[PDB]
Subunit: 451 residues, 4 copies
Amino acid sequence: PPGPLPNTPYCFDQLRRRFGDVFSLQLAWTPVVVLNGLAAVREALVTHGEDTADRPPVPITQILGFGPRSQGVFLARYGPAWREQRRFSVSTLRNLGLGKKSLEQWVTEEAACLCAAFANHSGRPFRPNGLLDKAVSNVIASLTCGRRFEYDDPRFLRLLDLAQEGLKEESGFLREVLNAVPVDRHIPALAGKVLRFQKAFLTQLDELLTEHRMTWDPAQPPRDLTEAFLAEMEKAKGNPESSFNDENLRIVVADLFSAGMVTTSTTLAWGLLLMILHPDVQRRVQQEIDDVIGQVRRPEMGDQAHMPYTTAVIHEVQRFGDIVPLGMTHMTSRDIEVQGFRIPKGTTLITNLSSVLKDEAVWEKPFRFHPEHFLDAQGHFVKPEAFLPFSAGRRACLGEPLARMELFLFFTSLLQHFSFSVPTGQPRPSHHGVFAFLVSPSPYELCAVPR
Amino acid sequence: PPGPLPNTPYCFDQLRRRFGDVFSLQLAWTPVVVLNGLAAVREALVTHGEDTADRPPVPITQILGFGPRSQGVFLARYGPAWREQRRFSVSTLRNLGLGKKSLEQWVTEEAACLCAAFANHSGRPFRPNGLLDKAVSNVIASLTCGRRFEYDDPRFLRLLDLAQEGLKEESGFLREVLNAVPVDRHIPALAGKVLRFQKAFLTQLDELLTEHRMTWDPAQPPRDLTEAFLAEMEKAKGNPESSFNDENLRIVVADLFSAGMVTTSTTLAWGLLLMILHPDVQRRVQQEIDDVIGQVRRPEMGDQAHMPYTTAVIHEVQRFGDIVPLGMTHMTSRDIEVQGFRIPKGTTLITNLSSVLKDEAVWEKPFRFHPEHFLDAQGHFVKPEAFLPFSAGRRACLGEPLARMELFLFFTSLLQHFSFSVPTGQPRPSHHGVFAFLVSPSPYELCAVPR
Amino acid sequence: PPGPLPLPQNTPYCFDQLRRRFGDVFSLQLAWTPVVVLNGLAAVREALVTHGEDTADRPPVPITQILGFGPRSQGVFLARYGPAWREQRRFSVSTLRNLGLGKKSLEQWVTEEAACLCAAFANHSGRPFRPNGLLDKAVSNVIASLTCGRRFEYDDPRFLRLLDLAQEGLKEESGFLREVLNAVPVDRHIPALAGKVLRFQKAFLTQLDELLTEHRMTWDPAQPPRDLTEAFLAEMEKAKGNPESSFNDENLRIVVADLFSAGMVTTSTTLAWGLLLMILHPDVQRRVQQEIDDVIGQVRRPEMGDQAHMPYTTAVIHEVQRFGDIVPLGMTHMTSRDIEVQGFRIPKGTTLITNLSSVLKDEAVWEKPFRFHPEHFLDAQGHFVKPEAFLPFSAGRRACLGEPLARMELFLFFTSLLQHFSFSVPTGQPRPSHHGVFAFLVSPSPYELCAVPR
Amino acid sequence: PPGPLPLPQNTPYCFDQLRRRFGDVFSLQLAWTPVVVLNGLAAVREALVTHGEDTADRPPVPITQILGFGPRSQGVFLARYGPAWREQRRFSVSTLRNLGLGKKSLEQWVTEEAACLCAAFANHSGRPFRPNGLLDKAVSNVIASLTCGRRFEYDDPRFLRLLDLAQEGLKEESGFLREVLNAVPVDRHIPALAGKVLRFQKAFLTQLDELLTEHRMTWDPAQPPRDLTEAFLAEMEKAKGNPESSFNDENLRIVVADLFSAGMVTTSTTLAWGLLLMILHPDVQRRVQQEIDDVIGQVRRPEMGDQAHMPYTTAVIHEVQRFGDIVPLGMTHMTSRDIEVQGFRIPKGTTLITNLSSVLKDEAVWEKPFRFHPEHFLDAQGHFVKPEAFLPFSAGRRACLGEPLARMELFLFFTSLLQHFSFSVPTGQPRPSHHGVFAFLVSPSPYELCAVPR
Ligand code: HEM
Ligand code: HEM
Ligand code: HEM
Ligand code: HEM
């Protein structure tokens, strides 16, 4: 399983073009394998997806005192616990997604608030990041709290703080997880002070959902995800195992919040940046907006099908933005062939999602913002198989349906109500982004003016 | 002038204890000299202070289109321009300082707001950084705008943001200034897009002070620094030179804001952190507060002289906090002896202020929070010569008088009104800080409860 | 002149990215003083050939100053574009031509050195060894012939000290040389405590100084010069008026020093790549020997003339140089006045880095850039061809002085060795790496090989 | 067990900080798996002596797996605390003593090697050279004597191969050894393409394998063993019941391999420090020679017995060791069960780093820790004393096996040399560095010296 003997994506590109698509890091120690084709990624996550759906250990789990059946989804290990919970959330997001417009309602009204909040800046320039976080966040709060939050609500502002800083604390641990061993089984616990904010963030949910159980009517069909969880807690009251505890509830919600907010929010931030950066495209999206939705009604999901160019654009934002370059890290559950190579049980798989998204041999102009990628000769939307921002296989993103929804509803709502540009003095912002395990656009401010 | 042939502070300590106090970096290319004693620093900045008050070139000045007589103070080069302006600001801070309690007025009321703002969190935990930035910022706003700003004011929120990100943008250029050559005289100007936020920040001042210009009564004694500047402008209208332009006004204010806010704010953050970290000391400070000021009246500058322990404490916060470890970077105006060594005209001097503040041969417990450092056998305040957080000599900090004020007034006002602790679940924060050209405490939250 | 802007140890897999993000010409340190990296064959040709007269300057380095170079007492390698370097480039090309062809002088010296190298190999009796130290002695001796009159016994203590001195001195200068992709000249007057830094480079000059001092005593002033030193001494008389002119004692020893360092390690390392690849592709080795037996035979010594009739060996030798790719960034250049390349203005006094590797491994030029593939140099009929992308010695007014002598060394040593021996990996051993350790000079990772007669 | 917490090559001047911020015992990687750095003399003694039992384990390294170690076919150096290592520590200390002064065996072999070394030096005729290669040969030969019966001619191709193999092989292993301040064991089954990584270490085993195979032909099974291999072979006979027992052919060559690598480089590098400091402090050189002429004279060969009557030379040699400080971090240890040092709990299986440098250069112990200062070892009357802080060979159940033989080598080689020659810096040259290049082994930066008779 190749690789050499003795900042990271522009780096992996070299190793790829020296070693092929599948290659090994740390051959001599414990091998960590980097998957690079669309071909390589599909083979590992789809073809052998059941055996590569495990998560490599991280001290986060231990530090936060996870254990038995009290891990979330994100870092949960392949086993009953995770399967239980992947099951529950996909079930729950499909019932609420369609069902009685529940998820749609919550999003569309959140868009209306976001629009209000933008409008409140009176075309005086600002940076849309904080607002984009609140909006996206609220959608998850609806899903898991019953309520949405006032943008100025101190509780909400604390929650956001808690979820942001908790997430910078864990990415420390998460990037090192491209090498060293599990943890001495028993981390020092002085290790406590390291996830302060992550732990503080659990504590605040713990209570927000404690007061939600008080609201909840046990003798009626569940209204949101928490309620559907609590209900399921009843069925399983017997079972000494089963991952439906109070313990797990808050982690699950915590996961949804972190995994959910920042990814959707950051994308919309690339969206807006690219919109002011290619006003050509912006007009055309709005041209289509006025033709299909008009200026009176609220954009709804049904419009999506009739909106080739907007759809195309949204997808190109995702592919050019390329926000989670290495996705999240996997581990084998038993040995496995990929492209001929033996890959032993327990092995770190790094899934170079960026290499698929920016594949030179797939996309007409991989390093350019180019909505054509998604448009056929007639201007119908098409989506290449290389389109994998939410990854693929057993462990692909839980949120995909809700995110597809958020990106379409927020993005249109905004381009319907406003025209975005670069502030009239300013020298015009960068295409390139700052590269963590999550890539944001470098800070820009924009103007929003009505039409 | 010694040094070796072919992180940074724990690093220089080695080279010190291998090469002595004055040593050279880049001996073979262009030598950059690092000054290390209290002895070494005093000899360079005080003794030869007139020849070492120059600032090494940076692309910032060029990029922002500084030039003739249109640099501020901070990055201004040794010459008429900077002299003119150091002059003007020390004069102005001295008159406003005592004069008619102007600066004291502005500070004490700002402390009252800060206290209000804290009290608005109802003992539910928060991190004080944002509030500490607003308060300190307002003091500069008073100095330079006439009024203060509502904490929730969108213009103010934009201003702070602009001053923050613009300062992050410049510290990139500022830490590289421990090596490579000036700039090709004519930077690429595509280099524009690099200081977007610093430039955006100037533009917003430009208009905040433009509307002050109209408020201002030219036939009366100037009320604040801007006014005093404008007065001095009409005066020098003759002189084709003179640094009293519109051009320079905004850079000067910009300098005051950036140099002023973040330093004072960060210190107070270290203050509160150390307060909740050593409740022992907190009580004692409050013991004195109750004895000297009481529970009715607002702490005023006069009280300082009667408050040995609080003074001691505030100073130990500064010394342990050690926020600007390398100070700001200097350059020789002509050759110079220090500790025997020839130091050619045009030479980067790095002033290891941390090595002075944490001098092992000077302080009884350099790496510990220890207010005794400043208390004699009878518990009178004393200040060692090694106390140099504002540096020393020709180019020491302009703000020192206003900062001493800010620290005393804010810090006491707060410990008079509240008791600070670590949130009741939480594992208790770190002594150690994140090391840029400015060192902050790692993020902590605290509770503020009345007494 | 493009390149990335900030907010912010090995470098060629790195430049490949910046190339495919910024195009072929790009800038490092845009905001400070720009350093420009040339990437195409197109980009390189345009700077070093088209504007060659304005890009043939060398960027300052503390080496010159530390070694107390100055007026007309710099060598060729680090000499600054001016009368001095011009003077000396011309002398050495003149001198290498005359001796090259002339009376088989250079050929004679190389062939017999091959004969010793072969003897040295044969003395290991098929028991494995690494060929590096022998390859350094042989190559070195060719330069010793050029500049000292005689060759050296492989066990000679003076020789062994010389090689030691030239190796470590070269190790001391590469420190300075890699940093020369950024900071300013030197305070005009380096600290001189800076002495202790080139100890071995200085020691190496002192020993030459003395080997050539005793050559001067041998030299017959009233007869045609027999080697490069002699032709230098003659030219020194000629100029004994001129207060300027770079023909001093001062400059002699630097010039030789340059020839020794530039010359030995480069040729030597290539031959090391040659043998490694030979044992690594025994397929090719047989074919080269097939040809050898056809053209030269088993009795006479390979000579330069055979080269023309040996397509496949030529091909191979060239593919060794291209895959080996030993001096990836070449040596560093500087503009003498502004210049445009690919549309871009490039100001007087500017560090040019010439990415030779990017030309040699050009994806858009070579069928299989990352593979050992002699076909690169063979047409459909199996005649030797050389693409324009073949630039291991670089190009333009400052391209390698040594090219004719090195073409000669590679051909003669490499054939001589494949004529007499068969090389292979020692019988237990796991088989060595294609990849090499990346200094400003890239070697093969250490391997040992067996040399058995045929 | 203290140490810093996060959010985020040249490591000893680094540890000094953490020491003076966290105390003597502190933790690396608290949040992952803790690695503990011992700093006092106090901290080191407590761990290695007091709990020496339970800290005598070696942390896993891919080296063992890669070299196909396994059951009880590990050497001593990397061997894991167990029957295997106990067996073999015991065999080597037993054997080194019997040979130490039983019948002057070890002494005879060292003293004659000194006499060759002296000849080899003398053969450079006062013309300058660097003593490193010769220092490696001599030290190496002592080990050859112990393990091959033979010594080797300094020009012997086999010997030259062997040294080459033992150097590069040791280069290759220090890659692995310095990462062993963090990441996990190895996937139990390393990729084996991992083969190509220790080529030279494996090549080195193979050559011993067959130097010692021809030793067994020589060896007379019905007589008292005359060196370490022979003693091993006899012990192998007796254990040819026991299915376990570490006395195999398998283990023999690793044991020798260990003795060669551990042994040669350390002793050789010290002597290199010794000579460098001698030319660097000619003041001290004369005084050592003054003592030499007083005690040994100019006729007879220095012998071990002279050591007792030679306070100043002893002092000096010890100061060379302390100042030189060649293995700064020693070798890395691991706990066999939990353990409480300076109050702190240290869990079963934990990487202990023993900062030997911090003990040798302890500021609170040595009058002038950063200066070459033989007084450290001389009392008020000029009797030799040795502080407890003198720990170059470390301490405890896993302290250096070679100490007696090393003490011997240092005295005999060092005196022999200073008796016959006077060492100085070459007459042109600017005079070398006190400071050294910092691997897991610290050498003096390359210097050359002159040896002239007296
Ligand atoms: C454009 C917005 C989003 C993007 C680009 C995105 C992308 C991803 C990616 C790449 C993964 C890694 C899957 C793997 O390990 O192969 C992931 C996992 C995950 N995501 Fe998303 N996501 C987005 C929105 C959301 C939101 C809205 C939610 C919840 C509301 C969510 C919840 C999750 C969860 C729970 C996982 C862990 C999956 C598991 O461990 O079973 N994501 N996401
Ligand atoms: C505890 C709060 C503060 C600290 C620790 C501090 C520290 C420093 C330091 C170390 C320098 C570098 C001087 C040198 O180059 O050697 C400096 C310069 C400067 N500071 Fe402060 N400062 C503080 C507050 C302030 C405030 C409140 C102001 C204005 C309101 C201010 C304005 C300036 C200016 C304009 C300079 C540039 C001096 C010149 O270039 O002439 N500082 N300060
Ligand atoms: C395969 C063996 C060799 C290779 C690959 C090689 C390559 C090079 C390269 C890349 C340069 C840099 C030119 C530039 O600045 O663009 C150079 C320069 C030079 N080479 Fe070589 N060379 C080899 C053998 C030799 C030998 C045998 C000699 C002399 C015996 C020699 C003498 C020189 C000299 C004196 C320069 C400096 C040119 C100047 O500044 O005018 N080279 N060589
Ligand atoms: C000045 C010469 C030498 C020095 C400074 C030296 C130093 C050391 C040190 C620091 C250790 C590490 C012990 C530990 O783990 O704490 C060690 C171990 C060892 N040394 Fe030496 N050594 C020297 C000479 C020798 C020689 C001459 C031999 C054999 C001829 C030798 C054989 C060994 C062996 C086999 C070990 C491993 C001990 C074990 O794992 O049980 N050393 N040495």
